[PDB]
C-alpha cells in the first residue's frame, strides 16, 4: 500500500477538513500543492484525477477520491483503528452524515463560496445583505446543533466537527462569531483548539485564508 497523497492548499477549508482527519487518524501522507488561485486545478493531469477540478482530492493507491466529506468518511472507514470518528451505528452515522451534508450546502456552498467566488472574480459591488444573513443563519443553526453536547454530532469528536470547523474558522473573516451571542460555538471552538494537531491541520491554513481575503476591500450592504 503506497502512502496517501492529498492535493490542495492549506488555505482551503475543505482541504483542512482532510488534514484534521489525517492527523486524528495518525495516517502518514504526502501533501502536494495545487494552487487553485493560479488555476493549477485545471491542469489536464489534475482533470484526469478529478473532473470537478476541486481541492481536496486524495489518491489512495491509484484511486482518486474527491469532496472532503467523501474523503474523510472513507479515511475513517478504511484506516480508523475504531469507528470513533465516524460511527458505524446507523443512527449515530445519520447525525454525522446530516452535519456533513449541512456543511456541504448550507455552509460551504451557500455561505462561503457564494462570497469568495464573486470576490475572486473581481466584483466590487459590495457584498449583498443576503450573504451576511446566510452566515448568521449558519451560526444560529450551529448554536442549536451544539445544545446539550460537547461536539457537533453528539458527545464524541467526529469528522463532522472537522468539516464544520474548517469552514466556520474561515467564515469568521467575514463575520466574527460573537462569543456572547454564541457561547456554545465559542466553547466548541475552544475545545477543538485544544486538540494537539488543530493548529497544524486547520489553524495555520485558516490564518493564511484570512490573509488572502484581507487583500480585498470588501463590505457588506446594509440592505
Ligand X SMILES: N[C@@H](CCC(=O)N[C@@H](CS(=O)O)C(=O)NCC(=O)O)C(=O)O
Instruction: Considering only the stretches 8-16, 137-145, 152-160, 211-219, report the one whose residues sit in contact with ligand X under the rule CB under 6 A.
Output: 8-16
CB of 209 within 8 A of CB of 170? Answer: yes
And the C-alpha cell for 64? 482518486
Could you give the 3-state DSSP secondary structure of residue 33?
strand
Question: Which position among 14, 139, 161, 202 is part of the footprint of ligand X (CB under 6 A)?
Answer: 14
Could you give the 3-state DSSP secondary structure of residue 64?
strand
Whose Cβ is closer to its own copies: residue 119's or residue 195's? 119
Closest to 177 in 3D by CA, of 129, 124, 86, 111: 111
CA–CA distance, 48 with 45 (Å, rounded to integer):
5
CB of 39 within 8 A of CB of 33? Answer: no
Which of its own copies, ligand X, none lies near 55, with the C-beta cut-off 5 to 8 A by kind? ligand X
Instruction: Considering only the stretches 31-39, 108-116, 189-197, 201-209, report the one whose residues sit in contact with its own copies under the rule CB under 8 A.
Output: 108-116
Whose Cβ is closer to its own copies: residue 118's or residue 203's? 118
* Chain positions contacting its own copies, by CB under 8 A: 51-52, 63, 65-67, 69-71, 73-74, 77-78, 90-91, 93-95, 97-98, 100-102, 104-106, 108-110, 113-114, 118, 130, 141, 144-145
Amino acid at each position: 500500500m503506497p502512502k496517501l497523497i492529498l492535493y490542495g492548499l492549506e488555505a482551503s477549508p475543505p482541504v483542512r477538513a482532510v488534514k484534521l482527519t489525517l492527523a486524528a487518524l495518525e495516517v502518514p501522507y504526502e501533501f502536494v500543492e495545487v494552487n487553485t488561485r493560479a488555476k493549477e486545478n485545471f491542469s489536464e493531469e489534475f482533470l484526469k484525477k478529478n473532473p470537478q477540478h476541486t481541492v481536496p482530492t486524495l489518491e489512495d493507491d491509484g484511486h482518486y477520491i474527491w469532496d472532503s466529506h467523501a474523503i474523510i468518511a472513507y479515511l475513517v472507514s478504511k484506516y480508523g483503528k475504531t469507528d470513533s470518528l465516524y460511527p458505524k451505528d446507523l443512527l449515530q452515522r445519520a447525525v454525522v452524515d446530516q452535519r456533513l451534508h449541512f456543511e456541504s450546502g448550507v455552509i460551504f456552498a451557500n455561505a462561503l463560496r457564494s462570497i469568495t467566488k464573486p470576490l475572486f472574480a473581481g466584483k466590487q459591488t459590495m457584498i449583498p445583505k443576503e450573504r451576511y444573513d446566510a452566515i448568521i443563519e449558519v451560526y444560529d443553526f450551529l448554536e442549536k446543533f451544539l445544545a446539550g453536547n460537547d461536539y457537533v454530532a453528539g458527545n464524541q469528536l467526529t469528522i463532522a466537527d472537522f468539516s464544520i470547523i474548517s469552514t466556520v474558522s474561515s467564515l469568521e473573516v467575514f463575520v466574527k462569531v460573537d462569543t456572547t451571542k454564541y457561547p456554545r460555538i465559542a466553547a466548541w471552538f475552544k475545545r477543538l483548539q485544544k486538540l494537539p494537531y488543530y493548529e497544524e491541520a486547520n489553524g495555520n491554513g485558516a490564518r493564511t485564508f484570512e490573509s488572502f481575503i484581507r487583500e480585498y476591500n470588501f463590505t457588506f450592504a446594509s440592505n
